[PDB]
Design a protein around this ligand. Structure first.
Ligand SMILES: Cc1cc2nc3c(=O)[nH]c(=O)nc-3n(C[C@H](O)[C@H](O)[C@H](O)COP(=O)(O)O)c2cc1C
Ligand SMILES: Cc1cc2nc3c(=O)[nH]c(=O)nc-3n(C[C@H](O)[C@H](O)[C@H](O)COP(=O)(O)O)c2cc1C
Lengths: 196, 196
């Protein structure tokens, strides 16, 4: 019920202290990765790839694809292989994607295109954290790293092709070893308004 | 259990056809807005505001704040009013925010700053769609609008101060009047990899 739904939003908090002797089970972790696999994305393009840093219980680096444009190899690939659509750059549909990105959304630079794909990964990460809370597992979203040094690092180890992907965001997962931090938020009237 | 958690991810789909005679109850809607209020954000800044377009059952326009920088009026405001932190631009902490944004995240333009705040709103919208699915309510995330015309429109009606906010994304909520669309996604090995 709605009481339970709201309660879960308090259970989900940014856990900073983790129980080093309790790990997420193999099966629970596979379910959370599945949650990430099944996340929605704009135009269904899934412009992402997740890395588990095995080398908290589990640490995920979310990658977002670069240059995901109507005429890109990746878009043609996902449309054929996943969507089973006979996609080509001169179709009405390709042209709808082109207008949507270039004009509707002003995705006119490499950075704006990358940040657009990165937004989709925030859905993917959010869904995982919320599913983790449903399983009684804690998480913390993580932006606090130097993106240039991290990407140099990953590229050096051979786990990032910087032409194709950039690092988007990270999250860790495990079991908390601290109390649930009470929420502090703006009051409803400040962050929500009805138009007429 | 994990079976139920994964099942929910199939229940949540992009509903395009809605039952025009069934509306979300007042209490269920207030719970979903609460889900949006309680969403996490980078540095806890909540750089957002939601609008219900009342003038699917419920249509939400997610706004993200512009120019949310270490020295901005908004950051000083949220730190004091919500976090009850005696924040000032010359503190170690203000300087950590400055370095994080400018250097770690390369937020060096109005657009990059705006898209960073917009990413946080995708978490907010994701959490609402997932909570909606927990309540048996359907949703569709929506990027398919012309951002310039929409923002001109909202500004004209007096519901958008374009100096302070931009439109980030939209979503609609209600009850489906069609079958659940089966998921099509990349296979696990394509979108997920373990480092060592
Ligand atoms: C995208 C994003 C990035 C975050 N990055 C960090 C981080 O790098 N380090 C950290 O300690 N907390 C990080 N957080 C946690 C936020 O401080 C926290 O979510 C926010 O204060 C709201 O608190 P709550 O998550 O407990 O509800 C991040 C949160 C978000 C959503
Ligand atoms: C951020 C984003 C924006 C979307 N915008 C639209 C849209 O404007 N119009 C539409 O029909 N569907 C839109 N969708 C729905 C996607 O096509 C859909 O999520 C994707 O194909 C995956 O299918 P599923 O959501 O049913 O799992 C959007 C989805 C995302 C996440």
């Amino acid at each position: 019920d709605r009481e339970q739904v709201v309660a879960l939003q308090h259970q989900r908090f940014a856990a900073k202290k983790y129980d080093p002797n309790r790990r997420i089970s193999q099966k629970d972790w596979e379910a959370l990765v599945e949650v990430g696999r099944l996340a929605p994305s704009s135009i269904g393009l899934e412009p992402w790839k997740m890395l588990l840093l095995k080398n908290a219980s589990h640490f995920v680096i979310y990658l977002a694809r670069k240059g995901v444009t109507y005429d890109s190899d990746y878009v043609k690939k996902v449309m054929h292989e996943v969507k089973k659509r006979d996609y080509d750059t001169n179709s009405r549909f390709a042209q709808i994607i082109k207008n949507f990105q270039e004009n509707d959304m002003k995705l006119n630079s490499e950075r704006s295109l990358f940040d657009w794909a990165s937004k989709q990964t925030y859905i993917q990460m959010a869904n995982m954290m919320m599913a983790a809370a449903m399983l009684g597992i804690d998480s913390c979203p993580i932006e606090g790293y130097d993106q240039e040094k991290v990407e140099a690092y990953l590229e050096e180890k051979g786990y990032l092709n910087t032409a194709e992907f950039g690092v988007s965001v990270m999250a860790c997962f495990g079991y908390r070893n601290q109390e649930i931090t009470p929420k502090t938020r703006w009051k409803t009237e400040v962050i929500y308004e009805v138009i007429e």
